[PDB]
Design a protein around this nucleic acid. Structure first.
Lengths: 104, 271, 63, 63, 37
RNA sequence: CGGAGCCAGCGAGUCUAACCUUGGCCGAGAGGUCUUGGUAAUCUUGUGAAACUCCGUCGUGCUGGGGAUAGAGCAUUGUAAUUAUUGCUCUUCAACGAGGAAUUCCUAGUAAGCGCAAGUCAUCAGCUUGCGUUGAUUACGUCCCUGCCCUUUGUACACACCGC
């Protein structure tokens, strides 16, 4: 494609949800680094956030990190239904949880 | 005492001729009547301790692997050894390894050798004697190695050692001293005049005493691979030992040598 | 490097311990007057061409 | 870091008589993914000339 | 389950005929599967 | 990995029962609903299998290889699924960087890779058998090892002495 070149402006290692993320992989496979989040989960989250996933995680603005975190604490409000989450139909609360990385 | 003595007598009625007929086992025993000899031979044959070869006009008795070890047990009743038999850990090629126990209750290792009529037995005997003498040479030189108890004509009974192989050992803290150890020990091998070509991961056995005093040792079992330095191909054998240590410490322990390793030309000024 | 060019003229049979090597009678290609006996590892039919290095070496038998 | 990786492609590709997928990652500046983006971009510019194209390896030539 | 002569050892359980491989080769010359090749 | 192309054959199928199922709607799927065809070279079936072909994503990093282990729920057969029968969804991502002493099988569509079908089948295979797709290397020599025999005949010391 078109070689879109950036004069610096990317950070090597970002940190999100209290966990270090390498800002050089694709954003799916850079957010796969944290616990409780796999390939298809980060993929569907960034498709609901409309993130270009052929772009690396160094070329990602923190506003999209805020969007990804908003889908983290709101998966069921952003049209990602109950089959896709970690703890569906709990016994303690009866709800559907997606247990995050450092909150296990 | 008496039945074991007569079974020792027919053991000694084997080193006279080839495949032994019936009246020689009658008369070498020198017992009273037809009863003891014939019912003993039938007890042998029903327990497969003896076999019948009937070559024309000629009865004969064929000893298999079964009816020997009792005498070895009797030979080891003489030498204070094993009372209880049987726990399978390892069925090797030229030996079958069992875990046994004495009257004292300590577990030991019983390597029976199966390498018929005389030659299977006798070559198992030569193998056991050769390995016992090699163990004696290693312990006399001072190599850390299991201590031999006895070599009951073709069955070697030795100690048990609390070790596990290095393939399941992730690393230790003192990796460069372990590399200097596994270099200097092959140096000591070349200073013995020998090269153990199978110096692999499954050979080297580590006993683990503590985590503070660090007073431990090693166990090296490479017996049908040790080759004298005078032979045709010992150069790359030594180099395979050195380089298997180095490639394991690069692959597993992620350690590269800062001092250069010894060559065969380095160790030619040794022994 | 002397590249000896050779000609298979007469096969002698199958030798070697494993029964793999072949004794081959050789017409030397550059000079017809040399007839050598050589040892060949591999399939050879009559009137084939070999590439030896020494015309002067001859080995009696093998085991 | 845009003006001190990108133009070395424009110096090296006219130097190299043979430009393919993994004889252009070898300069140790770039990844193996964006290298093919630079390949197609030099196709569009014209320094890279297509010889043959496959989905795993693509052969080109300098201009 | 052998429903013919109580001969569970080696039932041929295919197609419900349920004959043991001993008695199947007893009755092999009644069905027609015989030796050709 | 993500799309696309979509190539076979051996089988096998229901009665006094619930077999093989085409198609249509619902469900992310598992699956469910409604029927229809076939007792069979007819329907399932042209079994649109897998490996394969092409194009994009990846970029050598225990990696986007691996999928062991574990959590959560949802469905199917079974009276009964707990030590989970099994299927589906997300997550947790372990040893394992071509493997020792030693070991097995093999000469053309054979090996090897691949899946499918039939019996085990109430549910699943990593069990067994046949089928088809792609399709090497290298012998066509040997008794040198491993043995297996086939023989030839030096012979029984026809059982001798002893030291013991």
């Amino acid at each position: 494609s078109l070689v879109v070149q950036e004069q610096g402006s990317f950070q090597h290692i970002l940190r999100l949800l209290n966990t270090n993320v390498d800002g050089n992989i694709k954003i799916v496979y850079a957010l796969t680094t944290i616990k409780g989040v796999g390939r298809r989960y980060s993929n569907l989250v960034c498709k609901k956030a409309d993130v270009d996933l052929h772009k690396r995680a160094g070329e990602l603005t923190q506003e999209e990190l805020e969007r990804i975190v908003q889908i983290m604490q709101n998966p069921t409000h952003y049209k990602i239904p109950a089959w896709f989450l970690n703890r569906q139909n709990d016994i303690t609360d009866g709800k559907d949880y997606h247990t995050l990385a450092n909150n296990v | 005492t008496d039945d074991f003595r007569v079974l020792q007598a027919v053991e000694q009625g084997s080193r006279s001729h080839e495949v032994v007929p019936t009246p020689l086992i009658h008369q070498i025993s020198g017992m009273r009547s037809q009863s003891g000899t014939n019912r003993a031979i039938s007890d042998l044959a029903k327990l497969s301790l003896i076999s019948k070869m009937r070559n024309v006009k000629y009865d004969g008795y064929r000893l298999t692997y079964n009816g020997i070890d009792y005498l070895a047990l009797k030979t080891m009743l003489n030498r204070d050894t094993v009372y209880s038999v049987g726990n399978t850990i390892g069925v090797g090629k030229e030996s079958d390894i069992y875990k046994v126990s004495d009257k004292n209750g300590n577990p030991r290792v019983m390597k029976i050798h199966r390498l018929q009529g005389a030659n299977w037995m006798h070559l198992s005997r030569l193998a056991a004697n050769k390995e016992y003498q090699f163990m004696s040479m290693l312990y006399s030189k001072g190599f850390k190695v299991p201590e031999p108890f006895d070599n009951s004509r073709h069955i070697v009974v030795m100690e048990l050692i609390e070790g596990y192989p290095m393939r399941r050992l992730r690393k230790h803290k003192n990796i460069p001293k372990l590399y200097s150890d596994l270099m200097c020990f092959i140096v000591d091998l070349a200073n013995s005049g020998l090269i153990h070509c199978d110096f692999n991961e499954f050979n080297i056995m580590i006993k683990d005493k503590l985590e503070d005093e660090n007073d431990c040792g090693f166990v090296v079992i490479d017996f049908p691979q040790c080759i004298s330095i005078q032979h045709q191909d010992a150069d790359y054998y030594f180099q395979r030992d050195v380089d298997c240590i180095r490639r394991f410490f690069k692959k597993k322990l992620k350690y590269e040598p800062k001092p250069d390793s010894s060559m065969l030309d380095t160790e030619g000024f040794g022994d | 490097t002397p590249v000896t060019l050779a000609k298979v003229i007469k096969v002698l049979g199958r030798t070697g311990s494993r029964g793999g090597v072949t004794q081959v009678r050789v017409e030397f290609l550059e000079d017809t007057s040399r007839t050598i006996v050589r040892n060949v590892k591999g399939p050879v039919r009559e009137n084939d061409i070999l590439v030896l290095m020494e015309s002067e070496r001859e080995a009696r038998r093998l085991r | 870091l845009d003006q001190e990786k990108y133009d070395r492609i424009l110096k090296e590709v006219p130097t190299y008589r043979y430009v393919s997928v993994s004889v252009l990652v070898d300069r140790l500046k770039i990844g193996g993914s964006l290298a093919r983006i630079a390949l197609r971009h030099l196709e569009k510019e014209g320094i890279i000339k297509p010889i043959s194209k496959h989905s795993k390896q693509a052969i080109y030539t300098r201009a | 389950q052998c429903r013919v002569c109580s001969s569970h050892t080696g039932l041929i359980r295919k197609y419900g005929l349920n004959i043991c491989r001993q008695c199947f080769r007893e009755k092999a010359n009644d069905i027609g599967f015989n030796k050709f090749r």
